[PDB]
Amino acid sequence: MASVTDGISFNENWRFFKGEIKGAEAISFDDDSWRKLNLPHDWAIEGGLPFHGTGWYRKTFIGDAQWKDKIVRIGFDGAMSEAKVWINGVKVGEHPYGYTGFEIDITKYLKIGEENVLAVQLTPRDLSSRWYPGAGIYRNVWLRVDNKVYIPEHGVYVTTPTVTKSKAVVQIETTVKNATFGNGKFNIRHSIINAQGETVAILNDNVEVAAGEQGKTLAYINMLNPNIWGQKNPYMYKLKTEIYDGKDLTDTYFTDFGIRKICFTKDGFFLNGEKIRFNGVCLHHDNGPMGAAVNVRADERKLQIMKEMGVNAIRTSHNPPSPEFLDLCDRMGLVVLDEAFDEWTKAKVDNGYHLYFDEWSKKDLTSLIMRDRNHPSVIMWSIGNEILEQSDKKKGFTVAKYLADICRELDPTRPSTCGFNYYPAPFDNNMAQQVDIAGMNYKPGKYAEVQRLYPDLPLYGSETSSCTSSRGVYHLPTNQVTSYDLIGPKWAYPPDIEFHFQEMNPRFMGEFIWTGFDYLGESRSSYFGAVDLCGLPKDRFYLYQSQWTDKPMVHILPHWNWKKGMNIPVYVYTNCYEAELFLNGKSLGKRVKGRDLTEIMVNTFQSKYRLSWDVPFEPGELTVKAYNNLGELKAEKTIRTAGKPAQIKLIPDRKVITADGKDLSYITVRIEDRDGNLCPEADNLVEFSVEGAGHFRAVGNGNAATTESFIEPKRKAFSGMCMLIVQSDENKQGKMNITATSKGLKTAKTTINVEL
């Protein structure tokens, strides 16, 4: 029956056509020549890069007999953008904003036994995004077959209004729709299920709902010795909510949730009774070579890499993310600023959200909070970013309030926030006061002043640094940017400056850097990421890791393929007390952090966050030793001058992947000399073959200025490396054999095993 099922995938077996064709909405339209594919799908990754035009999707399906007299809905988590949707030729849906999901009820129009046709037209416009949006049904689609008494979309809201070590209270609001002709009282059974799948608590409730109406009800249950959700231990519970009409089960509905408390004052943010600080990153929703199509593993990898950098917090610049991304943040212990919009009523781009803000702002923000208010990862609702209303002196604040009031109406359990780039406008124009917590974009030099002027505002750096670099590229002394991390736009400054102004202003909750990963644009890709587009750390990663992690480390830059005669400035990043540099054995001296300052060129800053030597380049090896204040060795790294490119090495991040059709292995591709040393500048075209249990998916190298295809089985190295991405086939177990080939280098092989 429909009573057991929450919502099943409707991603399989679609037809796609890029371009305008008239009559594609209809039941009788020949689509035998249309490309066949499974969702999710981003046609713009080809398939900055062109993201506008027209796309059609079609799916044909028999009305299953089990759907007779059922409520049937198709849930779309995201469609980019300007979507129209038909069932059996009848237009039943229209949705402009690509980042909020929507439902279409096809019940009235569904034909049981005969064929049905679901058509979706997307008409994304040019100049509708300042970053790469992608284009298509880039997020999962769901079929929802329900009995006539059921829980509608986003119909369970779980809060924890007491959280203590001895006891937490889990409060649950349930919404029930009555689509029968009869008034009824319906029983509700909440089963709270732990990490091992065992039901540990059950809460009963009920609700009277009249015919054709919707009803809500609230109950709470005690959890003794709760497993607290926290950053080191991100324990998740699961809620099974069952609806009953007398003895008959009518519906089942699942909700993941965590048990943690949050709290803020003007002096900071609090998680489970302790000062928390945001070592944060802004990320855009694309996964580079993988595009904007939702891939769970792609996101998992990105968030793991960010955690290794010391990241504990995410700002979803500048839109809602996928549920999958937030589920990952939940399971990985990251706290999230969940951001709804980039512009309000005043336009930043000709075809941005301002075209829809008047008619859609309340719907879309409501939809966001309804979708995400159960995620324990989400700690703030951010209403906007760098909005032009900041400079409307008389009335800009009204729009901020309006969105802020909506947040408070729907979820007072999390504070509102907003990213402000003007200064002092939004603080002087009563705007910053309309949200619970104010975020400054790129104003470390003003942190002290704004606290003098507005001492009752809670504050954090909503968007910081904007330093640019290209991985493993140094200019001594262009088309790429120096990985010595000095250059950026006019408002930009190096990470050292944020660190300095964070330490001087402890009331600031933290920073969210622009950006954690590189992202796709409209040079088609960004330079702002601490990690590059394909997931390879730049030196900036290590700078951040030196500041944000306890596990001892040390990093040395630049590479050591230079010309004899040159003075190379050598930088070292470490969380240790001091470090010592060694060229071929010769000690080039100690250097203590917070004492032997490095002069960064912005006017120029004496930085305590870097250790520096001036080295005359003799080739061979350069080794750095990091020590604690007792002189004990705690970390070391060794770089050496590599010779001519001789051989390809392949390093999978994972040698076993799930046989689900979606999971990936990210194989780092290294261009090495005869003795195994990375050739730090190699750009050799590498070709790839994938045989057996899976296929070639994608490829990439973190170069922003290239024009190479992400989806052809060929890619050039950039600064010694590139990345090959491979994927399982659904239900196909066994070995998957990768061969990597390049003109004049030793061929490389590796096996990826595929299970489940």
Residue numbers in the entry: 46 to 92, 104 to 533, 542 to 586, 607 to 686, 694 to 847
What does the paper say about this structure?
replaced with W657 and C598 in GH2C, respectively.
determined the three-dimensional structures of these four agarases. initiated by GH86 or GH16B, which generates NAOS. depolymerized by GH86, and systematically saccharified by the exo-acting GH117B and GH2C enzymes. exo-acting β-d-galactosidases, while GH117A and GH117B are α-1,3-L-neoagarooligosaccharide hydrolases.
